[PDB]
Amino acid sequence: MNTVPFTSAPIEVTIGIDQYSFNVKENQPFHGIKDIPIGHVHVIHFQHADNSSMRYGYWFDCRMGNFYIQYDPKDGLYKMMEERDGAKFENIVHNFKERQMMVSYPKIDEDDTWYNLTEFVQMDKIRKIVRKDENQFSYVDSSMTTVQENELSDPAHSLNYTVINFKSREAIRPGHEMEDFLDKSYYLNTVMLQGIFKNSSNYFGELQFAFLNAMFFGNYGSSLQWHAMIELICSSATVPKHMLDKLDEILYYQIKTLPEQYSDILLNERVWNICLYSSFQKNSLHNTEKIMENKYPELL
Amino acid sequence: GAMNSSNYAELFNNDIKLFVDDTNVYRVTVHKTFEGNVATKAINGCIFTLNPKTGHLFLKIIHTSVWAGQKRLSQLAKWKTAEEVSALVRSLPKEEQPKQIIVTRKAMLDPLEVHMLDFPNIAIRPTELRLPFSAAMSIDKLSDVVMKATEPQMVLFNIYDDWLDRISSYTAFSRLTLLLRALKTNEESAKMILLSDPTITIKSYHLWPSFTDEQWITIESQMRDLILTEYGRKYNV
Numbered sequence: 001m002n003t004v005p006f007t008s009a010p011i012e013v014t015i016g017i018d019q020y021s022f023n024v025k026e027n028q029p030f031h032g033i034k035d036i037p038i039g040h041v042h043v044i045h046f047q048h049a050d051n052s053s054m055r056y057g058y059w060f061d062c063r064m065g066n067f068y069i070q071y072d073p074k075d076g077l078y079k080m081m082e083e084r085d086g087a088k089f090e091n092i093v094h095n096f097k098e099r100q101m102m103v104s105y106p107k108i109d110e111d112d113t114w115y116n117l118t119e120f121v122q123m124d125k126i127r128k129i130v131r132k133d134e135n136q137f138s139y140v141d142s143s144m145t146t147v148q149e150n151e152l153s154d155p156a157h158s159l160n161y162t163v164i165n166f167k168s169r170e171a172i173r174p175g176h177e178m179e180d181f182l183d184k185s186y187y188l189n190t191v192m193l194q195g196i197f198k199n200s201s202n203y204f205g206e207l208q209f210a211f212l213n214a215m216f217f218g219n220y221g222s223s224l225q226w227h228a229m230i231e232l233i234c235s236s237a238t239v240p241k242h243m244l245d246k247l248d249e250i251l252y253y254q255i256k257t258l259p260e261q262y263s264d265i266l267l268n269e270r271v272w273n274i275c276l277y278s279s280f281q282k283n284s285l286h287n288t289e290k291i292m293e294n295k296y297p298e299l300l
Numbered sequence: 301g302a303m304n305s306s307n308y309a310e311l312f313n314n315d316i317k318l319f320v321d322d323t324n325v326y327r328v329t330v331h332k333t334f335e336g337n338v339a340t341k342a343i344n345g346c347i348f349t350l351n352p353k354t355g356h357l358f359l360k361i362i363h364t365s366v367w368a369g370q371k372r373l374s375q376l377a378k379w380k381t382a383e384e385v386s387a388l389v390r391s392l393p394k395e396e397q398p399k400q401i402i403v404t405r406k407a408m409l410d411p412l413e414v415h416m417l418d419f420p421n422i423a424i425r426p427t428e429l430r431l432p433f434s435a436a437m438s439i440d441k442l443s444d445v446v447m448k449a450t451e452p453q454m455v456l457f458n459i460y461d462d463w464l465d466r467i468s469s470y471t472a473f474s475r476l477t478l479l480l481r482a483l484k485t486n487e488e489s490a491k492m493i494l495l496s497d498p499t500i501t502i503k504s505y506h507l508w509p510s511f512t513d514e515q516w517i518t519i520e521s522q523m524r525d526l527i528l529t530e531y532g533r534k535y536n537v
Contacts, residue, residue: 167410169417177414178379 002062003093003102004044005032006078007070012049013078016057016216018042018114019257020106031101032069032093038062040114041121043140044069045216046078055217056141061123064136068092080137116253117212120205129160129209140213146221159213159221162196162206164228166235183280185238192232200243203229204250211254214266227271234275234285244284251288255295263296273300303402303427311352312469317400318358320385321348321433322408324446325362326377342367346446347381348436349388351398353469355460359442360384361449382411388454389419398422404431431477438483438490441507461506466513475520479508482523485530493522 004017009030014023017033024030026049036042045057058080060067065082066089072079083089096102107114123136130138146159165171171187172180180186197203207229214223233239233247258266276282276289277300293300303310311317325347328340345362366380367373389397400423403412413424437443445455460472467475482490500509511519531537 167413167417172414172417177383178376178411181410181414 001035001105002038003032003034003097004036004060004062005068005089005092005096005102006030007068010071010073014047014049015078016043016045017105019117021045022103029101030103031096031099032103033105034093034097034102035104035107036062037105037107037114040118041123041126043212043216044080048077054142056139057216058137058139059123059126059130060137064123067137080135080139082136113253113257116249117208117257119208119250120201121208121212122202122205125202125205126209129206131158131160132156140217140219142217142219144217144219144221146225149221149224159219159225161210161222161225162192164192164225164232166232183235183237184232185236188232188236189238200240200246204243204246208250208254215254215258215262218262218265220265223266223268227268230275231271234279234281237280239281239284244281247281248285248287251285252291255288255291260295263299267296267299269299276300301425303425303429305429308429309470311473314353315400316396316398317351317353317402318385318398319348319350319352319402319404319431319433320381320408320412321350321404321431321436322378322381323405323434324348324437325381326367326373342373344446344449345377346436346442347384348433349385350433350459352473355458355464355472357457357459358388359445359455359457360388361446361453361455363449363452366452378408378411379415381408382415385412386415386418389416389422400425402427404429404433432480432484435480435484435487438480438487439507441502457507459507461503461508461510475516478520478523478527482526485527489526490523493519493526 009024009028010026012024012026014021015030015033016022017036033044041059041061043057043059045055047055056077058067060080065084066086067080067082068089069078069080071077083092126138127133127136130140132138140159144157144159145153146161147155148161148163148165150158151163166181166184170191171184173186176186193200193203197206207226210222210226210229213219214226230247230251233243272292276285276292325345327343327345329343330338330340333339342364344364347358347360347362349358349360350356362377362380362384367376370376385401389401397419399421401412401416402425403409404427406426409424409426416422416424437446442457459476463472463475479490479494482493494509500511500515502509
């Protein structure tokens with residue numbers, strides 16, 4: 001179990017750790033989050049009591065170093081940092097626990113939800129989508145735009161998701177125009193899986209990171225990427241059985257975990273009605289279809 | 301964006317553009333089988349590709365053999381149209397390639413776009429206009445060349461004959477769509493009006509009679525009266 005200490009909490013802010021979140025009052029003595037489960041990626045995020053705009057946060061993994069949070073009054077936000085002094089860091093962490101000023105990551109032991117949302121998410125891949133390689137953790141916020149969004153401004157702050165475009169030379173072999181646009185199997189399996197992503201797990205991992213950024217920051221271009229990656233699978237006639245079955249699990253926990261009030265902006269009606277009812281893989285998403293119908297029959 | 305009554309006159313500027321009408325690409329008769337089931341028999345079709353500015357018509361004939369052994373033919377008809385339009389553009393010298401292609405039916409956008417991926421600077425546009433180009437097979441010479449064809453074949457025409465010697469493009473296109481609007485609503489009447497006078501002939505290199513200017517005015521009025529009448533009849537106004 002690992003710890004992410006906070007130097008202080010000088011402004012009123014709602015803090016999230018993964019799917020959990022806590023209200024912290026201006027200069028309440030909050031000094032960190034303990035018992036964070038080793039072995040997965042994590043995200044720690046913020047929404048100031050005063051600006052319900054700009055949700056922001058940090059993807060990290062505690063195996064890659066000792067991280068703490070510190071409010072910056074110049075830049076106006078909670079910043080994630082690395083302590084390189086191992087001894088100086090266990091010292092901080094042990095004193096705040098002794099004083100019991102830290103919350104416990106509140107994991108029910110029956111609950112695989114976080115593991116189910118991050119199964120294929122790996123910190124190394126995240127740091128390629130969010131290039132900033134003097135930190136081992138990654139910043140994301142509400143307003144960051146993706147590489148594909150920018151093509152249609154500032155690249156240092158871009159989300160370098162893999163560009164998927166159904167009407168591009170990449171997607172469409174010449175002479176197979178009609179075939180390849182109606183049956184994207186060759187874009188999916190040769191171009192994206194074997195070509196770019198190399199395996200299904202990196203693809204799933206990007207799909208999943210996209211979702212989480214959409215859900216936790218309302219990053220609209222991540223939402224677009226999650227939908228595009230779902231759609232490319234569902235619109236392919238030939239998909240390894242192991243991907244179809246894993247996809248149905250992946251989507252099930254994403255749909256399950258989504259705040260009920262948010263379905264309207266985070267769920268693209270066309271994509272889901274095509275995937276679940278019109279696509280080649282209509283019949284291969286039995287759990288995702290059951291949960292979508294019982295929870296959001298309106299969208300359908 | 302889409303083409304409509306507001307930006308109508310853009311059709312007649314000096315930016316090369318073509319209309320693609322796909323309505324007659326896939327044509328069938330519907331009949332009964334010996335066992336009483338229904339079946340279709342395909343007949344020859346045509347893509348109607350038209351430069352509204354100059355009258356040039358790229359009549360690509362679609363031979364029934366194209367369909368042999370194919371499923372989902374009405375869907376395939378759209379991809380074939382897009383394929384042939386793409387091949388046409390590719391065959392034209394650069395300075396003749398269009399800057400815009402306007403498809404009369406929105407279902408053509410995705411097939412055409414996909415087939416034009418090599419021509420990113422050619423804009424594919426829909427239209428809100430209700431153009432009568434399905435009546436192109438009501439022009440006898442066009443229906444004749446399509447129905448006799450024994451192979452794929454492109455036949456080139458000027459759909460305005462020699463009108464542009466005496467009128468503008470804008471007015472030529474208005475005449476053409478009025479004629480074809482009338483052929484569509486009541487072909488028998490429309491064709492009666494055009495040939496009632498045996499002394500007015502069609503040149504061998506033309507599609508329409510050689511009306512004088514004054515005779516065209518009477519024709520146009522007779523076509524307008526035909527179209528209005530048919531409307532009251534349709535709706536009982």
